[PDB]
Amino acid sequence: KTRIIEFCEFSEEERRRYDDFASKQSVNSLLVMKTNLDTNANLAKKKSTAGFVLVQLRKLADHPMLFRIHYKDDILRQMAKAIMNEPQYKKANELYIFEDMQYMSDIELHNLCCKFPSINSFQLKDEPWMDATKVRKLKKLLTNAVENGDRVVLFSQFTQVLDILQLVMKSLNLKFLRFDGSTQVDFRQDLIDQFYADESINVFLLSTKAGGFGINLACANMVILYDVSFNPFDDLQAEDRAHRVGQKKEVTVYKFVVKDTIEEHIQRLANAKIA
Numbered sequence: 700k701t702r703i704i705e706f707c708e709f710s711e712e713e714r715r716r717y718d719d720f721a722s723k724q725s726v727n728s729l730l731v732m733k734t735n736l737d738t739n740a741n742l743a744k745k746k747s748t749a750g751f752v753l754v755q756l757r758k759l760a761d762h763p764m765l766f767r768i769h770y771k772d773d774i775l776r777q778m779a780k781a782i783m784n785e786p787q788y789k790k791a792n793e794l795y796i797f798e799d800m801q802y803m804s805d806i807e808l809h810n811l812c813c814k815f816p817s818i819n820s821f822q823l824k825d826e827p828w829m830d831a832t833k834v835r836k837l838k839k840l841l842t843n844a845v846e847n848g849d850r851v852v853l854f855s856q857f858t859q860v861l862d863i864l865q866l867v868m869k870s871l872n873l874k875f876l877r878f879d880g881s882t883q884v885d886f887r888q889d890l891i892d893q894f895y896a897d898e899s900i901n902v903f904l905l906s907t908k909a910g911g912f913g914i915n916l917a918c919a920n921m922v923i924l925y926d927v928s929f930n931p932f933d934d935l936q937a938e939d940r941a942h943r944v945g946q947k948k949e950v951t952v953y954k955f956v957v958k959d960t961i962e963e964h965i966q967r968l969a970n971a972k973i974a
Contacts, residue, residue, distance in 0.1 A: 724752055
């Protein structure tokens with residue numbers, strides 16, 4: 700367990716969204732007072748702490764194709780026109796299907812069109828997943844599984860980020876097994892045993908909800924955290940699966956970061972106290 704916290708510089712496409720997300724997020728309501736029933740002096744001040752702002756950022760920080768960046772609004776209509784030729788056909792469904800769809804992200808909307816093959820005219824987009832700061836530094840980190848026979852153990856904050864990675868690894872190296880956070884039914888085995896074979900079963904995708912009370916084998920030397928967390932509940936317990944004394948080689952822990960984004964800020968940037 701050697702801490703290496705390799706930052707990851709911007710792109711043009713990534714800043715495009717993040718820098719232009721200083722405007723819409725900057726709602727002109729706090730530091731203008733909209734008119735209510737009575738003197739709502741602090742109600743609107745505490746209508747603030749809209750942490751959706753925060754969480755949205757800490758998802759922008761992460762893989763930016765889980766935002767709405769492919770189907771604007773009207774391509775979901777062509778899906779909705781070219782999906783009623785199926786068993787999904789009730790009395791009146793053409794507005795409620797397009798409404799329920801238009802709140803799903805571009806990962807949920809990709810994960811039905813390729814699995815349920817009834818809308819295949821505009822599913823793929825030349826693999827837009829690979830094009831992302833973190834996935835390309837991850838493309839660089841798979842080269843550490845080229846020099847040597849190295850297997851990795853990879854963690855995820857949000858479930859959608861797993862589902863991105865579920866089809867990131869249908870592009871560079873093949874994928875086989877998605878260890879979800881909601882896999883705490885009764886001591887999992889088949890999803891954790893037949894692993895560590897040469898080149899057809901290399902890397903396996905873990906989650907936050909997957910507890911830290913236990914671990915698995917430490918043969919997996921490298922560990923990559925896609926994102927960074929909030930409190931000390933899984934600081935050390937997620938990051939002690941290769942904190943051993945019986946290893947025989949080097950073993951480095953790894954967590955992704957960004958350029959000049961709030962993710963760098965929650966990995967503290969302030970100042971220590973000379974007391």
